[PDB]
């Protein structure tokens, strides 16, 4: 029900990001979501945006915007500490299983 750009904007602010980005919602044949550090563009797969539950979208957007905040493409302790401000390890396990069950 909540517009996808409103969700992205809420996450940019809750992550305390103060660098403007571009948001593109488009069909994507190779990915669900991506972030270009060169053009500061967040790309979200249109089908996923229109068909995945809000919590899965939250997790997906957080993944990309945490990379942008910490200026790292890796998923170690700096990434994990940012994600833990939103979802516990057990909550991430449940979301990750739900995303897989939507793909296969």
Collect all residues with Cβ–Cβ distance below 8 Å to 79 and sequence separation of at least 6: 66, 67, 70, 72
Taking CB under 5 A as the rule, does residue 88 contact Cl ion? yes
3-state DSSP call for residue 27? coil
Minimum CB–partner distance for residue 34 and a second copy (Å): 8
What, of Cl ion, a second copy, none, does residue 88 touch, CB below 5 to 8 Å by kind? Cl ion
Q: What is the tally of helices (H) and strands (E) in the chain?
A: 5, 3
Nearer to a second copy, 5 or 102 (CB): 102
What, of Cl ion, a second copy, none, does residue 99 touch, CB below 5 to 8 Å by kind? a second copy
DSSP conformational letter for 56 = H
Taking CB under 5 A as the rule, does residue 1 contact Cl ion? no
């Amino acid at each position: 029900k909540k517009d996808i750009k409103d969700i992205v904007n809420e996450i940019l602010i809750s992550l305390n990001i103060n660098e403007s980005i571009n948001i593109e919602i488009k069909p994507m044949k190779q990915k669900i979501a991506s972030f270009s550090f060169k053009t500061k563009t967040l790309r979200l797969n249109k089908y996923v945006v229109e068909n995945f539950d809000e919590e899965l979208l939250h997790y997906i957007i957080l993944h990309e915007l945490i990379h942008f905040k910490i200026k790292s493409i890796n998923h170690g302790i700096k990434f994990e500490n940012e994600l833990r401000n939103y979802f516990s390890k057990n909550e991430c396990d449940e979301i990750e299983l739900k995303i897989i069950q939507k793909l296969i």
